[PDB]
Design an enzyme around this catalytic site. Structure first.
Site, PDB file in Angstrom:
ATOM      1  N   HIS A 149      13.739   3.978  18.070  1.00 46.06           N
ATOM      2  CA  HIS A 149      14.592   3.434  19.111  1.00 46.06           C
ATOM      3  C   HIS A 149      13.730   3.135  20.335  1.00 46.06           C
ATOM      4  O   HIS A 149      13.004   3.996  20.823  1.00 46.06           O
ATOM      5  CB  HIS A 149      15.700   4.413  19.471  1.00 46.06           C
ATOM      6  CG  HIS A 149      16.230   4.230  20.853  1.00 46.06           C
ATOM      7  ND1 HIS A 149      16.794   3.050  21.278  1.00 46.06           N
ATOM      8  CD2 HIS A 149      16.256   5.066  21.916  1.00 46.06           C
ATOM      9  CE1 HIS A 149      17.157   3.169  22.541  1.00 46.06           C
ATOM     10  NE2 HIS A 149      16.845   4.384  22.952  1.00 46.06           N
TER      11      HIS A 149
ATOM     12  N   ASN B 160      16.049  -2.015  26.666  1.00 47.00           N
ATOM     13  CA  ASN B 160      16.733  -1.060  25.807  1.00 47.00           C
ATOM     14  C   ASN B 160      18.130  -1.576  25.460  1.00 47.00           C
ATOM     15  O   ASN B 160      19.032  -1.551  26.296  1.00 47.00           O
ATOM     16  CB  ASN B 160      16.808   0.297  26.521  1.00 47.00           C
ATOM     17  CG  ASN B 160      17.531   1.350  25.721  1.00 47.00           C
ATOM     18  OD1 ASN B 160      18.231   1.047  24.747  1.00 47.00           O
ATOM     19  ND2 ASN B 160      17.370   2.607  26.126  1.00 47.00           N
TER      20      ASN B 160
ATOM     21  N   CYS C 167      22.206   4.915  20.884  1.00 42.09           N
ATOM     22  CA  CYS C 167      20.859   4.641  20.414  1.00 42.09           C
ATOM     23  C   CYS C 167      20.526   5.268  19.063  1.00 42.09           C
ATOM     24  O   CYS C 167      19.501   4.940  18.485  1.00 42.09           O
ATOM     25  CB  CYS C 167      19.848   5.107  21.462  1.00 42.09           C
ATOM     26  SG  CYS C 167      20.081   4.308  23.085  1.00 42.09           S
TER      27      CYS C 167
END
Lengths: 337, 341
Positions: free
Chosen positions: A264, A294, A114
């Site tokens: 993120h 995500n 990430c």
């Protein structure tokens, strides 16, 4: 020569994992609770033998239609992924040929999660501003779905598969278009987000395949992803605001001069908690992962792409990009888009 | 008035694992391949082999320790870690993240892994130069480490006579001066070479199967499975002879640099036969063309830094010498750069 983000294109796979389907599979987590906790309505899942490199290929193909970069112009490929095709050869090497990119282009894979987009940007910028490349194709792609245990609700509610393609190109001008950067790495966080088995620290065995149920009813093995959500959240709240303040100090920039803080897109709970602690108004703080979840390294470029499409991102806007997660690893940078 | 930051190689340290795989032992394992024949064909007498549970990152760790012991830089000065490897600890997290922590490197350091092979060092240098000369880092720790041994089939003679395990740590720092100390670069990628140097099974393109564990014997009597390294030596050699001299020429032209001004052509130390073919094709004199892998074999990304370390140990590499570095291999991938050491 100043590195700039020339264009971005995203790709999500076809199969949809809805909250209603997760609710069928997890009685204790109905659709309204999953959405309440995570802010995620659906995630896209890569087809069974569709790899991260395949998703990146589709992203690049989409990028190459848009009118800022094509295959022939790419002189360096960076594939940021944590699910490569082989241990060797490098997945970016095969993407070079598959995309019709010239053989005099550089190509390599980067393993980050990430945090990977911001790190990718720093590498691309380094390459462009040292004359090693005029057009870096930064690719992000992940298929976390391929190592989530089917009964690990905590991770299946969060993670989606996806990819993006960004062109970072030599531009000329008076303003720094990408940077400066702040980086972070803390390997103590390794055990809190990890696929322990299947490479060289721990090859697969009888033990590594052994299932084990936790306190919250989540089943797992050493061969699947383990995420300690509480630890990762603690890390995020401790490091991200800190990095944002440090980045502003590094740049000599007041926080009022930032038009958008693009983080993120971990999930709505994490982002709300970060936004509150950072004292950033909601209009400067996109939360855009409702329909994709995500996507690991692709969260930022997918967010940026959405912002362009919905009219909230335009050239000259001053951004802070912040990436943070597995490693632990984190990074932030300023962008003058 | 003031000079911009120039990426320079402050220091290099190598680490090889303890176990030695000698030509004599290989000659016992492969009765039709006496030590003298292995030597004649490869120019490699010994390779080092990582202990069973020792990973490439572990080797990298010790290379980095040795580097800090050499005293040009310390762990506290490192602000970016790049690990070039093809045998990382985990799918995730990044092995560079764990090395950062193990080495006691500050948490404001960047860290990431790069997957490349014998091209990796030169590519690594381009990345480290990028970070240093854009001001993103002042002291990049460039690590190379490989444990190819862990996926060589026991009966694959072709690869076992060639590959050794090992690592290196290079400190790429900001100097300030008139000379570009690292660069310019030429790069190459050709994914058509993918099938000629590959571990097919075990990751996400081809998960392990009943068939991937099946042994097959090839045209040369070498045995492997798809879960082990396959190297088409003939193809890799032909690729190398085609691209490496072209890359070198292209690099010199790009740099406006006459071929005669290069003091040393330091090539990926594939093996003596390959290096001999390349030297002769490239028309380089022997004294400008080190062949230094007799005692470690082909250590993949670590070939170049180990070669450079050896040249410094024996006084053939000094500050101010004009080098060409050439890396080439799996991908296919290759890269060249000039260095003013």
């Amino acid at each position: 020569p100043r590195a700039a983000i020339a264009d971005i294109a995203g790709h999500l796979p076809e199969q949809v994992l809805t909250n209603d389907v997760l609710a069928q599979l997890y009685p204790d987590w109905p659709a309204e609770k999953i959405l309440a906790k995570t802010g995620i309505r659906e995630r896209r899942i890569a087809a069974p033998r569709e790899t991260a490199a395949d998703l990146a290929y589709e992203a690049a193909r989409k990028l190459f239609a848009q009118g800022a970069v094509g295959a022939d112009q790419v002189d360096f490929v960076i594939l940021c992924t944590q699910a490569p095709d082989y241990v060797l050869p490098t997945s970016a090497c095969m993407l070079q040929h598959r995309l019709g990119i010239p053989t005099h282009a550089g190509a390599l894979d980067v393993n980050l999660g990430c945090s990977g987009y911001v790190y990718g940007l720093s590498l691309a910028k380094g390459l462009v501003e040292t004359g090693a490349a005029r057009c870096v194709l930064l690719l992000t792609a992940d298929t976390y779905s391929k190592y989530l245990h089917p009964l690990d609700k905590s991770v299946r509610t969060l993670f989606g598969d996806g990819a993006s393609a960004t062109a970072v190109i030599a531009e000329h001008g008076e303003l720094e278009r990408i940077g400066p950067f702040v980086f972070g790495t803390d390997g103590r966080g390794a055990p809190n987000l990890i696929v322990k088995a299947g490479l060289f620290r721990e090859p697969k065995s009888a033990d590594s395949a052994r299932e084990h149920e936790d306190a919250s009813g989540n089943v797992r093995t050493d061969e699947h992803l383990y995420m300690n959500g509480a630890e990762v959240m603690a890390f995020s709240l401790a490091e991200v605001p800190r990095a944002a303040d440090r980045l502003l100090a590094l740049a000599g920039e007041p926080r009022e001069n930032i038009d958008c803080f693009v983080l993120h897109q971990a999930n709505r709970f994490m982002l709300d908690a970060l936004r509150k602690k950072m004292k950033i108004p909601e209009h400067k703080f996109p939360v855009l992962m409702e329909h994709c979840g995500n996507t690991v390294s692709s969260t930022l470029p997918l967010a940026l792409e959405t912002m362009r499409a919905n009219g909230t991102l335009a050239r000259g806007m001053r951004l802070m990009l912040l990436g943070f997660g597995v490693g632990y690893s984190w990074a932030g940078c300023l962008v003058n888009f």
